[PDB]
C-alpha cells in the first residue's frame, strides 16, 4: 500500500516518512526530496475571487494566495495546495460550473 | 499553525523505502514427556 500510495502524491508520503515536511517527486523507482521552507501564518492573503477574466468558463480550482517569506519582505503570488502547502505556479485551473 | 513553501526537488537527494524484513517463526516449543510420579519428602 505504501508503494502504491506514493505514486499518487509523493509529497504527503515523503513528508510523513522522512519526518520533516519535504517536497518530493519520483525518479522512476526512487524519491527525490527537498526540504520545504516555513512561512509565518500571519503573512498570507487569500484573494477574494477564484475566476479568471481572460479564460471565460475556467477558474482556479484552489484559492489564489499572496505571501512574504520574511515578516517584511516583498509580496509574492502563489496558489494554496493541500495541507498548507503553497505552490509557486498559478496553473491548477478547472472548467468551472 | 504554519504555512510551507516547497521547491521543486532536484535529483540531488534520493531515498528509498526499506524492504520487507524477515522475522522468525514461533519458538519450537518444549518437548514434554508425560509420566507417573511419586514425590517423597
Amino acid at each position, epitope marked *: 500500500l505504501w508503494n502504491e500510495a506514493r505514486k499518487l502524491n509523493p509529497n504527503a508520503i515523503a513528508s510523513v516518512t522522512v519526518g520533516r515536511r519535504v517536497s518530493a517527486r519520483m525518479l522512476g523507482d526512487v524519491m527525490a526530496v527537498s*526540504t520545504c*521552507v516555513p512561512v509565518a501564518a500571519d503573512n498570507v492573503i487569500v484573494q477574494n475571487s477564484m475566476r479568471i477574466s481572460s479564460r471565460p468558463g475556467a477558474c482556479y480550482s484552489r484559492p489564489l494566495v*499572496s505571501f*512574504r*517569506y*520574511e*515578516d*517584511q*519582505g*516583498p*509580496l*509574492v*503570488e502563489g496558489q494554496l495546495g493541500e495541507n498548507n502547502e503553497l505552490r509557486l505556479t498559478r496553473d491548477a485551473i478547472e472548467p468551472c460550473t | 499553525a504554519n504555512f510551507y*513553501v516547497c*521547491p521543486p526537488p532536484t535529483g540531488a537527494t534520493v531515498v528509498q523505502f526499506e524492504q520487507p524484513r524477515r522475522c522468525p517463526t514461533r519458538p519450537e516449543g518444549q518437548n514434554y514427556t508425560e509420566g507417573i510420579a511419586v514425590v517423597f519428602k
Partner: antibody, heavy 119, light 108 residues
Framework: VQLQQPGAELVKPGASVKLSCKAS????????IHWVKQGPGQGLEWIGM????????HYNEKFKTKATLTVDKSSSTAYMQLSSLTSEDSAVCYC?????????????WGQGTLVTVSA | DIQMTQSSSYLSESLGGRVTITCKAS??????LAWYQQKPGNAPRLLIS???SLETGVPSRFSGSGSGKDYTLSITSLQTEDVATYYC?????????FGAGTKLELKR
C-alpha cells in the same frame, strides 16, 4: 562586505552565457541575493531574486527563460545562466544583498558586470 | 500591479540651490518606499529606506517624506558632486519596481 563581478563579458550574441558574483564579508548563506539589469542610461530593472540558503528562485515575470539563477554555497558564489542573448542585452547587471529584513533596500552591491553581448 | 510614476525626468539647479523631487505610486503602499541615487560611474547609493527615513552617508541636505500615494525628496545645498539619477523604489510586492530616474544636474 563586498561582491566581486567580472568587469565585462565580450560574448557573441546567440549562444547563452554565464555570470558570477563572489560574496565577501557577511554570511553568504543567511541573506537574500537579488539581481538587477540596466542598460546604458536606462531605468534599472530588477531581474530576479534568490535565497542562497534554500535555493528558492523568484524571477521577474519577463525573466523565466531569459535568465536562470543558481547558487554555490561552497564558494559563496551566485550565478546567472543567461539564455537567448541579444545585442541589446549588453548592460550592467548588479548582484545585491538585502538585510535579514527581506525588504531588500539593497545596501551593499558589487561593481556589477557590464556584459557586452557582441562579436 | 504596482507602477512608479516619477515626476521629473531631470532637475538642474545652480550651486547651493534647493530642489524637491517627488513621485507617485499606482497603488497604496503604506510608506514602504525607498530613494536611491546613482552616478554613472558607481553602483547606486541609498538615501531613504522607508518613505521617511534618512540613514548614514546622507546628510540633512537630503530629506525624504511622503504618505499614501505621493512621496518626495527635498534636496538642500545642491553641489557639483550630486549630479546623478535619482530613483524611487518600492518594496511592497513582487515584482519590485524602480523609478524611471530624475537627472539631478547643475545650472552650468
Amino acid at each position: 562586505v563586498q561582491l566581486q563581478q567580472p568587469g565585462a563579458e565580450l560574448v557573441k550574441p546567440g549562444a547563452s552565457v554565464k555570470l558570477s558574483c563572489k560574496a565577501s564579508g557577511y554570511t553568504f548563506t543567511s541573506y537574500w541575493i537579488h539581481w538587477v539589469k540596466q542598460g546604458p542610461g536606462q531605468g534599472l530593472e530588477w531581474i530576479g531574486m534568490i535565497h542562497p540558503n534554500s535555493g528558492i528562485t523568484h524571477y521577474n515575470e519577463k525573466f523565466k527563460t531569459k535568465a536562470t539563477l543558481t547558487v554555490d554555497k561552497s564558494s559563496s558564489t551566485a550565478y546567472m545562466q543567461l539564455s537567448s542573448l541579444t545585442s541589446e542585452d549588453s548592460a550592467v547587471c548588479y548582484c545585491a544583498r538585502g538585510s535579514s529584513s527581506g525588504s531588500a533596500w539593497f545596501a551593499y552591491w558589487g561593481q556589477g558586470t557590464l556584459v557586452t553581448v557582441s562579436a | 500591479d504596482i507602477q512608479m510614476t516619477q515626476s521629473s525626468s531631470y532637475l538642474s539647479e545652480s550651486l547651493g540651490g534647493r530642489v524637491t523631487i517627488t513621485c507617485k505610486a499606482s497603488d497604496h503602499i503604506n510608506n514602504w518606499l525607498a530613494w536611491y541615487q546613482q552616478k554613472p560611474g558607481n553602483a547606486p547609493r541609498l538615501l531613504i529606506s522607508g518613505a521617511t527615513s534618512l540613514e548614514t552617508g546622507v546628510p540633512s541636505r537630503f530629506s525624504g517624506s511622503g504618505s499614501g500615494k505621493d512621496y518626495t525628496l527635498s534636496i538642500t545645498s545642491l553641489q557639483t558632486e550630486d549630479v546623478a539619477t535619482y530613483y524611487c523604489q518600492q518594496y511592497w510586492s513582487s515584482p519590485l519596481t524602480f523609478g524611471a530616474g530624475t537627472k539631478l544636474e547643475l545650472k552650468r
